[PDB]
Design an enzyme around this catalytic site. Structure first.
Site, mmCIF file in Angstrom:
data_model
loop_
_atom_site.group_PDB
_atom_site.id
_atom_site.type_symbol
_atom_site.label_atom_id
_atom_site.label_comp_id
_atom_site.label_asym_id
_atom_site.label_seq_id
_atom_site.Cartn_x
_atom_site.Cartn_y
_atom_site.Cartn_z
ATOM 1 N NE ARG B 9 1.554 -3.413 -2.434
ATOM 2 C CZ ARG B 9 2.362 -4.458 -2.326
ATOM 3 N NH1 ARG B 9 1.970 -5.576 -1.739
ATOM 4 N NH2 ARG B 9 3.592 -4.380 -2.820
ATOM 5 C CD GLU B 455 7.825 -7.197 -6.555
ATOM 6 O OE1 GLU B 455 7.118 -7.315 -5.533
ATOM 7 O OE2 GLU B 455 8.791 -6.409 -6.628
ATOM 8 C CE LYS B 474 5.541 -4.073 -12.421
ATOM 9 N NZ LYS B 474 5.124 -3.045 -11.433
ATOM 10 C CG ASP B 524 5.651 4.296 -7.348
ATOM 11 O OD1 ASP B 524 6.621 4.960 -7.763
ATOM 12 O OD2 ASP B 524 5.750 3.113 -6.955
ATOM 13 C CG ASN B 525 9.186 8.333 -7.727
ATOM 14 O OD1 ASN B 525 9.523 9.437 -8.152
ATOM 15 N ND2 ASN B 525 9.428 7.208 -8.386
ATOM 16 C CB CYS B 580 16.165 12.432 20.868
ATOM 17 S SG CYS B 580 15.723 13.820 19.805
HETATM 18 N N1 LIG Z 1 11.414 7.069 -12.071
HETATM 19 C C1 LIG Z 1 10.694 6.116 -12.669
HETATM 20 N N2 LIG Z 1 10.861 5.922 -13.993
HETATM 21 C C2 LIG Z 1 10.146 4.972 -14.597
HETATM 22 N N3 LIG Z 1 9.247 4.139 -14.070
HETATM 23 C C3 LIG Z 1 9.101 4.352 -12.760
HETATM 24 C C4 LIG Z 1 9.769 5.294 -11.996
HETATM 25 N N4 LIG Z 1 9.364 5.230 -10.673
HETATM 26 C C5 LIG Z 1 8.478 4.264 -10.667
HETATM 27 N N5 LIG Z 1 8.267 3.692 -11.892
HETATM 28 C C6 LIG Z 1 7.358 2.597 -12.207
HETATM 29 O O1 LIG Z 1 6.101 2.941 -11.683
HETATM 30 C C7 LIG Z 1 5.357 1.734 -11.407
HETATM 31 C C8 LIG Z 1 4.809 1.865 -10.011
HETATM 32 O O2 LIG Z 1 3.496 1.267 -9.991
HETATM 33 P P1 LIG Z 1 2.964 0.504 -8.718
HETATM 34 O O3 LIG Z 1 3.333 1.306 -7.476
HETATM 35 O O4 LIG Z 1 1.531 0.183 -8.858
HETATM 36 O O5 LIG Z 1 3.847 -0.797 -8.704
HETATM 37 P P2 LIG Z 1 4.960 -1.430 -7.762
HETATM 38 O O6 LIG Z 1 5.794 -0.273 -7.221
HETATM 39 O O7 LIG Z 1 5.697 -2.524 -8.421
HETATM 40 O O8 LIG Z 1 4.099 -1.953 -6.560
HETATM 41 P P3 LIG Z 1 3.909 -1.691 -5.011
HETATM 42 O O9 LIG Z 1 3.723 -0.178 -4.904
HETATM 43 O O10 LIG Z 1 2.600 -2.396 -4.662
HETATM 44 O O11 LIG Z 1 5.080 -2.206 -4.252
HETATM 45 C C9 LIG Z 1 6.381 0.599 -11.481
HETATM 46 O O12 LIG Z 1 6.271 0.032 -12.779
HETATM 47 C C10 LIG Z 1 7.721 1.336 -11.442
HETATM 48 O O13 LIG Z 1 8.590 0.636 -12.318
HETATM 49 MG MG LIG Z 2 4.710 1.297 -6.016
HETATM 50 MG MG LIG Z 3 7.337 -3.518 -7.849
#
Ligand SMILES: Nc1ncnc2c1ncn2[C@@H]1O[C@H](COP(=O)(O)OP(=O)(O)OP(=O)(O)O)[C@@H](O)[C@H]1O
Ligand SMILES: [Mg+2]
Ligand SMILES: [Mg+2]
EC number: 6.2.1.45
Lengths: 75, 985, 147
Positions: B9, B455, B474, B524-525, B580
Site C-alpha cells: 500500500r 494479512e 483482528k 472502508d465502504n 461495448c
Molecule cells: N460492513 C462492515 N462491518 C464491519 N467491519 C467492516 C465492514 N466493512 C469493512 N469492515 C472492516 O473494515 C476494515 C477495513 O480496513 P482496511 O481497509 O484498512 O483493511 P483491509 O480491507 O483488510 O485492507 P486493504 O484495504 O489494504 O485490502 C477491515 O477490518 C474490515 O473488516
Molecule cells: Mg480495505
Molecule cells: Mg483485509
C-alpha cells in the site's frame, strides 16, 4: 466571405459564410455537405471551441480563417 | 529489493525510487516522550534504514500519559532503554539502537535529526552544526493543546514532486503543424502554462516520440499550444501526451536566522493573528524553564502565569516585535504548560513523521518553516477547571488531568463507546482511548466489531499486530493488545466478529444501541457507512466518521438534533465502462484489465460452478433449460469440462492453454476484422476504425516471446489447479509439448423442426449421469490478489498485455495490473495517525456535550502539500409541518401498533394531512391508486400483520420497532415531506 | 428515492401509456417488470417484450438498470438483453421519467445504430444484406416475441 474547415483525416472543405452567421448555420452547412449531425460537430478555431447560439464575429473569425472539425461519438 | 509483500500500500503513495532512496538514510531522534515515540513508530513503519534514540532522562509516572510503550514497572529507568526493545519489533528490516551520550561531531553520521523536549540553547547548538553541514533538522514540541513544528532542510533542497499527483496524461486527437494540440472529445488536459510534456506513439511525427520536453501554451480547456513543429512534420495523428515535472530548488534558513524573521504557515484562515503569538509564547516557555531549573509553570497558577507574561513582554521588547500581546491566550498557554495529551501527540507525531519522509526522500513540498497549531476550542466548559482540580494526583493520567481536571476525568472514565471496524484507524483509536482512560470506571465499557482477518500487507500500518498473528481475527488481537497497553481495561472490552449490516440486527439490537454513548466508524465502504449512519440517526447517537486516501484525510462529527447526517455527505460515484467498449473496442489499459478479469472469471470460475451444481442438484438440467438465458452454453460447458476436454496430465493442460490462446487472441480478432474490415466506412462515409476505435491485429503464437510463455504457464497452472493436478515451471516441458502442435484450420464464417431441441438432447444424453460421479467436485478459482503464488495476477497481467498488443495499446507491468485489478486503495500510517488525532480531539468535545454548532469542526488535510483546513458542520435543514418547526433528519413520529385505517384517520385529523403512500423498507404497504377491493381487504389489518403478509416473512422475535416511510399530501393537494414513523410493536 | 419512485408510479397510473405498462414486481419498489409493444412499422410488429428495471439506491441521481428478457435480434442488444443506449450511461439526469426511457427504447427498436454496435455480426448483416436482416428479425420476433 470564405473559410476552410480541416477534418481529422486531412480533408479541407471550403465554405462561403458571413461574419454575422451563427454557429448553428455553419453546423447546418457542414451537415448538408458531409452528413454529420450538428450535435456531434466540434468546431475549434484559434484554440477555442465554437459554441452554439453565437456568431462568427463573436470569435473574431475573418477572411479565409481555418477551423478544425472533430466528432464526439457516444458509446 | 523492496518487499512488495509488506509495502504494497505504501508504494502506491511513494514509489519504488522514493522507498529505495529512503532505505539508505539514518534518522536520529532526541527525546523519547509521547511525541518522540510516536514519530519513531511512524518512521519505523515507513521503512528507513535505521533509527537511533537518545534520551537519558529516567522515567516518571506522569510520562505514561502519552507513552504507550511504557509500563508502571519501568519507573526510574531511562525511557530509551525500555523503549528500544519494544520498538525493534515493529519492523524486522529497521534496526533500532540507543546512544548513551551525544557529541556534536556524531551528528555527521545521520541523514535526518528530529529534536523534541529540548531547551533552546541545545537547539541552537545543534542547529548551528546541522545547518552548515547539510543535515535535515526537524524540531517538534507539544505543550497541552498547542503544538509547534520547525523544518530546516538546508539551503539547496531539491524537490522532485511538488504536489504528490501523478503526471497528467492524455490522448491526443491530432496535432497541427502550428503546434496546436487537442485532446479527444470532451477531454480536459488540465495543464497550466509553462509546463513541459512529452509525446509518445504519435503517427506522422516520429521525431516527437523522442521525449524532449516542450513548452505548453494553454489556449483553452480542451486545446493548447506547444510552439513550432515545422521541422519534424506537418500533422500528427493520434498519440499520447504525458506531463513532465521539473525539480524545484528550495532554500531554507537556519534556526538562528529564522528566530528574528520567521516564516509562518497558517493552518486556518479564520484566525491568522495567533501564530505570531505562539512564536513568542514558546520562546517564553523555554526561557522560563531555563530560569527555574527546567520546571514548567504549574497548572492554573496565577503567579507563574504573571511571571510567564512578564517573560513574554521581555522577549517581545528584545526581538523588536511590533505585535500587541494577547493576555488571555498567553495565560491560557501558561496554564497548560505542563499538559501532555495523547491526541495532540499523535497528530504532531504523524505530521513530523511525514516531514521526516519528505526530508529523506526529497519528495513532496515540506513545511516552510514554522507551523503553530492549536485546538483550544476543545477545552471543556461544562465542568470546573481551576488550580485545585487540575493538580496532579500521582496517577498515570496526570498529563491529562493537568489540562482537563478530575471531573472531566470521571466523565471520560464512564464512557460506553462503540467502534465499528478494526483497521488502521481502529487500531489508532483504540490506542488513544486506552491512553486517555476511556471506559475505566465502574459503568464504562467498550465494544469493537470486525469480521476480517490479519494479512501480511496489513502489518505495514496496523501496529497492534505482529507477523506471528497472521491469519487470526483482528478484533481479538486488538483487544488483547490494548488490554496489555492499559491493564485497567481488562474485562472492559468486548470484541465481536460480526459484519455490521441488516443481518446483524439480532446482535446490535435496541438493547445494545440504547446504552452506547458514541459510535466511531473505521470502515472502508460506503454501504456500511450509510447503514451505520441510518442506525445512529434512528437511535440519536453521536457519530464520528473518518476517511483516508493516500496522504489525504478527512474527519466529520455528527451530533443529534444539531448537524446533518452522513447520508447527504455522499461522495461522487465511481467509474464503470460500457459493455461495448470492453467487448470489442478498447482504447486504454484499464479496458484490457477489465476484459482480462472477466475472461478469468468466465474461464476458471463459472464453468466450475455449473459443473458442481450439475453434480449436486438432482434436477439442475431441467431448471437450467427453462431458466438460464443460454442453456446451450451451460450444457456445452458441462460437456467440455466433464468428457470432451477433461485433462489427464499436464501436457493436456498445456494443449488446452494453447487452444484457448488461439481461440481468444487469434480467431475472435479475425472474426471482428471480417465483420468490420480495416477499410470499412460508417453510414456517413467516415472511416470506421478512427478516433476512439483502434484497428486490431491477430497475434501469431511465438513460443520464444515472453508474454506468450507467461500466458501459457498461467493458463496451464490455473487449469491444473481447477482439476487438482500438479503444475510445472520448467520451460523444457512447455517447449517440447508445444513443438508438436498442429493448429486446427480456422476461417471466418458469414453464417447464412426440433433440430435445435434434438441437438440439445444429443448433448444431454452424452453427459455422464450424476450418479456415476459421486464425490467428484471441481475447485473454483476464487480471485485473491494478495497471494503471489496463485497465478491470478500473473494471468491477468498476461492477458491484459496480450490484448494491448492486439489493439496497439501500451502494456503495463505487474505493479499497475495489481493496482488496477484489485481496486487497492493507497494508504499511509501518517494519515492514519493524523485522522485518529483529529477524531480524538473531537471526541473530547462530544463528551463535554457542547451545544453550539460553531464549537465543532470538520477537518480535512492533504500531507503531500502540507494543507490543513477546518470548517464548521452544516446545520440540519429545517421545515414547516402543520405550522411547526420540524427537523428534517432528527425528528420522528411515535405511534402504537394500530390498524392502517386508524393510522390514516389519525394523520388526517391530528396532522391534517392525507396519506397517499406508505412503505416499510422496500415494500409498498399502501397507496392511494390501488384498486378499492385490495385496500378494503388490507385496511382492517394491523401494521405488523400487513407487513408480514406483504413481505411473506414472519417478524423476528427480537424485532421491537418498525420504520415506515410515508408520503402524504396537504389539504390543498401540495405534497409535503414528513419525518418517518416509528411504530412500536 | 422511494418518494421519487412513488411520484413516477402515480403519474404512470394516472396516464395509461397504452403502448407501455410498467409496474413493480410483487410489492418491491426497486424492481419493475415493464412491457413494450413492438411498433407497427418495424420488423418487430406484433410483439410483446418484457424488461426488468432495477432502481439504484441513489435514484434518480443514478441511471436505472434495464435488461431485456424476451430474446431479440437487434444490433445494439446482445443475447443477455443488455441495452446499448446513451441516456442510461452518461446523459442520465435526475429529470427523465421511466416513460422517457421506454419511449427511447421503442425508438431504438424502430431504427438501430449499426455504426457503434454491440453484436458486430448482426450489424455487419444489417449493413451488407438488409433483406436477410429483415427476414431474420421477422423470424426471431415471431419465434420469441409472440407467446
Ligand atoms: N460492513 C462492515 N462491518 C464491519 N467491519 C467492516 C465492514 N466493512 C469493512 N469492515 C472492516 O473494515 C476494515 C477495513 O480496513 P482496511 O481497509 O484498512 O483493511 P483491509 O480491507 O483488510 O485492507 P486493504 O484495504 O489494504 O485490502 C477491515 O477490518 C474490515 O473488516
Ligand atoms: Mg480495505
Ligand atoms: Mg483485509
Amino acid at each position: 466571405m470564405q473559410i476552410f474547415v480541416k477534418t481529422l483525416t486531412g480533408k479541407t472543405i471550403t465554405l462561403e459564410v458571413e461574419s454575422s452567421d451563427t454557429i448553428d448555420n455553419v453546423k447546418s452547412k457542414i451537415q448538408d455537405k458531409e452528413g454529420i449531425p450538428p450535435d456531434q460537430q466540434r468546431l475549434i478555431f484559434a484554440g477555442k471551441q465554437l459554441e452554439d447560439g453565437r456568431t462568427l464575429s463573436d470569435y473574431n473569425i475573418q477572411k479565409e480563417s481555418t477551423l478544425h472539425l472533430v466528432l464526439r461519438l457516444r458509446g | 529489493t523492496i518487499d512488495e509483500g509488506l509495502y504494497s500500500r505504501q508504494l502506491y503513495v511513494l514509489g519504488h525510487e522514493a522507498m529505495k532512496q529512503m532505505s539508505q538514510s539514518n534518522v536520529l531522534i532526541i527525546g523519547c516522550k509521547g511525541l518522540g515515540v510516536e514519530i519513531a513508530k511512524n518512521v519505523c513503519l515507513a521503512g528507513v534504514k535505521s533509527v537511533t534514540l537518545y534520551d537519558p532522562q529516567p522515567t516518571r509516572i506522569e510520562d505514561l500519559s502519552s507513552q504507550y510503550f511504557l509500563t508502571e514497572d519501568d519507573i526510574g529507568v531511562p525511557r530509551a532503554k525500555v523503549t528500544v526493545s519494544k520498538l525493534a519489533e515493529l519492523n524486522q528490516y529497521v534496526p533500532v539502537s540507543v546512544v548513551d551520550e551525544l557529541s556534536t561531531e556524531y551528528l555527521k553520521n545521520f541523514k535526518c535529526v528530529v529534536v523534541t523536549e529540548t531547551s533552546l540553547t541545545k537547539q541552537l547548538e545543534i542547529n548551528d552544526f546541522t545547518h552548515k553541514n547539510h543535515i535535515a533538522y526537524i524540531a517538534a514540541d507539544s505543550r497541552g493543546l498547542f503544538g509547534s513544528i520547525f523544518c530546516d532542510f538546508g539551503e539547496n533542497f531539491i524537490c522532485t514532486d511538488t504536489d504528490g499527483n501523478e503526471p497528467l496524461t492524455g490522448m491526443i486527437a491530432s496535432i497541427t503543424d502550428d503546434g496546436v494540440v487537442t485532446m479527444l472529445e470532451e477531454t480536459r488536459h488540465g495543464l497550466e502554462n509553462g509546463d513541459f510534456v512529452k509525446f509518445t506513439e504519435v503517427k506522422g511525427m516520429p521525431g516527437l516520440n523522442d521525449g524532449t520536453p516542450r513548452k505548453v501554451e494553454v489556449k483553452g480547456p480542451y486545446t493548447f499550444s506547444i510552439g513550432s513543429v515545422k521541422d519534424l512534420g506537418s500533422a500528427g495523428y493520434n498519440g499520447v501526451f504525458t506531463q513532465v515535472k521539473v525539480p524545484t530548488k528550495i532554500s531554507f534558513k537556519s534556526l538562528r536566522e529564522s528566530l528574528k524573521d520567521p516564516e509562518y504557515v497558517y493552518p486556518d484562515f479564520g484566525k491568522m493573528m495567533r501564530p505570531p503569538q505562539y512564536h513568542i509564547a514558546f520562546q517564553a516557555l523555554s526561557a522560563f524553564a531555563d530560569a527555574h531549573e527546567g520546571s514548567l509553570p504549574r497548572p492554573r497558577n496565577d503567579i507563574d502565569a504573571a511571571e510567564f507574561f512578564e517573560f513574554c513582554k521581555k522577549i517581545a521588547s528584545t526581538l523588536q516585535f511590533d505585535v500587541e500581546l494577547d493576555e488571555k491566550l498567553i495565560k491560557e498557554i501558561s496554564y497548560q504548560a505542563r499538559g501532555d495529551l495523547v491526541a495532540m501527540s499523535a497528530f504532531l507525531g504523524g505530521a513530523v513523521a511525514q516531514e521526516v519522509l519528505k526530508a529523506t526522500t526529497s519528495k513532496f513540498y515540506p513545511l516552510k518553516q514554522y507551523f503553530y497549531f492549536d485546538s483550544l476550542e476543545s477545552l471543556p466548559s461544562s465542568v470546573t477547571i481551576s488550580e485545585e482540580t487540575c493538580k496532579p494526583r500521582g496517577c498515570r493520567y496526570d498529563g491529562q488531568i493537568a489540562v482537563f481536571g478530575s471531573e472531566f476525568q470521571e466523565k471520560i472514565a464512564s464512557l460506553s463507546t462503540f467502534l465499528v471496524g478494526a483497521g488502521a484507524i481502529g487500531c489508532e483509536m483504540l490506542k488513544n482511548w486506552a491512553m486517555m482512560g476511556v471506559a475505566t470506571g465502574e459503568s464504562g465499557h467498550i465494544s469493537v466489531t470486525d469480521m476480517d482477518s490479519i494479512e501480511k500487507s496489513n502489518l505495514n500500518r496496523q501496529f497492534l499486530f505482529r507477523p506471528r498473528d497472521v491469519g487470526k481475527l483482528k478484533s481479538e488481537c486488538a483487544s488483547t493488545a490494548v488490554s496489555i497497553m492499559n491493564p485497567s481495561l481488562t474485562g472492559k472490552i468486548t470484541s465481536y466478529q460480526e459484519r455490521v449490516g441488516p443481518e446483524s440486527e439480532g446482535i446490535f439490537g435496541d438493547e445494545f444501541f440504547e446504552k452506547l454513548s458514541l459510535v466511531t466508524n473505521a470502515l472502508d465502504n460506503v454501504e456500511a457507512r450509510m447503514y451505520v449512519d441510518r442506525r445512529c440517526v434512528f437511535f440519536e447517537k453521536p457519530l464520528l466518521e473518518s476517511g483516508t486516501l493516500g496522504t489525504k484525510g478527512n474527519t466529520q462529527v455528527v451530533v443529534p438534533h444539531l448537524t446533518e447526517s452522513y447520508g447527504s455527505s455522499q461522495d461522487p460515484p465511481e467509474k464503470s465502462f460500457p459493455i461495448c467498449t470492453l467487448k470489442n473496442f478498447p482504447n486504454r489499459i484499464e479496458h484490457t484489465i477489465a476484459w482480462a478479469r472477466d475472461l478469468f472469471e468466465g474461464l476458471f470460475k463459472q464453468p466450475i460452478d455449473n459443473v458442481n451444481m450439475y453434480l449436486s442438484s438432482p434436477n439442475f438440467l431441467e431448471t437450467s433449460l427453462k431458466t438460464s438465458s443460454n442453456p446451450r452454453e451451460v450444457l456445452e460447458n458441462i460437456r467440455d469440462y466433464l468428457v470432451t476436454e477433461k485433462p489427464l496430465s499436464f501436457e493436456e493442460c498445456i494443449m488446452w492453454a494453447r487452444l484457448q490462446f488461439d481461440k481468444f487472441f487469434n480467431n475472435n480478432i479475425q472474426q471482428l476484422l471480417f465483420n468490420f474490415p480495416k477499410d470499412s466506412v460508417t453510414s456517413t462515409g467516415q472511416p470506421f476504425w478512427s478516433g476512439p476505435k483502434r484497428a486490431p491485429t491477430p497475434l501469431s503464437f511465438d513460443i520464444h516471446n515472453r508474454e506468450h510463455f507467461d500466458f501459457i504457464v498461467a493458463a496451464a497452472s490455473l487449469y491444473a489447479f481447477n482439476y487438482g493436478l500438479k503444475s510445472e515451471t520448467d520451460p523444457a516441458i512447455y517447449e517440447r509439448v508445444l513443438a508438436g502442435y498442429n493448429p486446427p484450420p480456422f476461417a471466418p464464417k458469414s453464417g447464412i423442426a426440433n433440430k435445435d431441441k434434438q441437438e440439445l438432447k444429443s448433448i444431454a444424453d452424452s453427459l455422464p449421469p450424476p450418479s456415476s460421479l459421486v464425490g467428484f467436485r471441481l475447485t473454483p478459482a476464487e480471485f485473491e490478489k494478495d497471494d503471489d503464488s496463485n497465478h491470478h495476477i500473473d494471468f491477468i497481467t498476461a492477458a491484459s498485455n496480450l490484448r494491448a498488443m492486439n489493439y496497439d495499446i501500451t502494456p503495463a507491468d505487474r505493479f499497475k495490473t495489481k493496482f488496477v485489478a484489485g481496486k487497492i486503495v493507497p494508504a499511509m500510517c501518517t494519515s492514519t495517525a493524523v485522522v485518529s488525532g483529529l477524531v480524538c480531539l473531537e471526541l473530547v468535545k462530544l463528551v463535554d456535550g457542547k451545544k453550539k454548532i460553531e464549537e465543532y469542526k470538520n477537518g480535512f488535510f492533504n500531507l503531500a502539500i502540507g494543507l490543513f483546513t477546518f470548517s464548521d458542520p452544516i446545520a440540519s435543514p429545517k421545515m414547516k409541518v402543520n405550522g411547526k418547526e420540524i427537523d428534517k433528519i432528527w425528528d420522528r413520529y411515535n405511534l402504537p401498533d394500530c390498524t392502517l385505517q386508524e393510522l390514516i384517520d389519525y394523520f388526517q385529523k391530528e396532522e391534517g394531512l392525507e396519506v397517499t403512500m406508505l412503505s416499510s423498507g422496500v415494500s409498498l404497504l399502501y397507496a392511494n391508486f390501488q384498486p378499492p377491493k385490495k385496500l378494503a381487504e388490507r385496511l382492517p389489518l394491523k401494521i405488523s400483520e400487513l407487513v408480514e403478509q406483504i413481505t411473506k416473512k414472519k417478524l423476528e422475535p427480537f424485532r421491537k420497532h418498525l420504520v415506515l416511510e410515508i408520503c402524504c399530501d396537504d389539504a390543498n393537494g401540495e405534497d409535503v415531506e414528513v419525518p418517518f414513523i416509528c411504530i412500536k410493536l | 428515492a422511494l418518494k421519487r419512485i412513488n411520484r413516477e408510479l402515480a403519474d404512470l397510473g394516472k396516464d395509461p401509456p397504452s403502448s407501455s405498462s410498467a409496474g413493480p414486481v410483487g410489492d418491491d419498489l426497486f424492481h419493475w417488470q415493464a412491457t413494450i409493444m413492438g411498433p407497427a412499422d418495424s420488423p418487430y410488429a406484433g410483439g410483446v417484450f418484457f424488461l426488468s428495471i432495477h432502481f439504484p439506491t441513489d435514484y434518480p441521481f443514478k441511471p436505472p438498470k434495464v435488461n431485456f428478457t424476451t430474446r431479440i435480434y437487434h444490433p445494439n442488444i446482445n443475447s443477455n438483453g443488455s441495452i446499448c443506449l446513451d441516456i442510461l450511461r452518461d446523459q442520465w439526469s435526475p429529470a427523465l421519467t421511466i416513460s422517457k426511457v421506454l419511449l427511447s427504447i421503442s425508438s431504438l427498436l424502430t431504427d438501430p445504430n449499426p455504426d457503434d454496435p454491440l453484436v458486430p455480426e448482426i450489424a455487419h448483416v444489417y449493413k451488407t444484406d438488409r433483406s436477410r436482416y429483415e427476414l431474420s428479425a421477422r423470424e426471431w420476433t415471431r419465434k420469441y416475441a409472440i407467446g
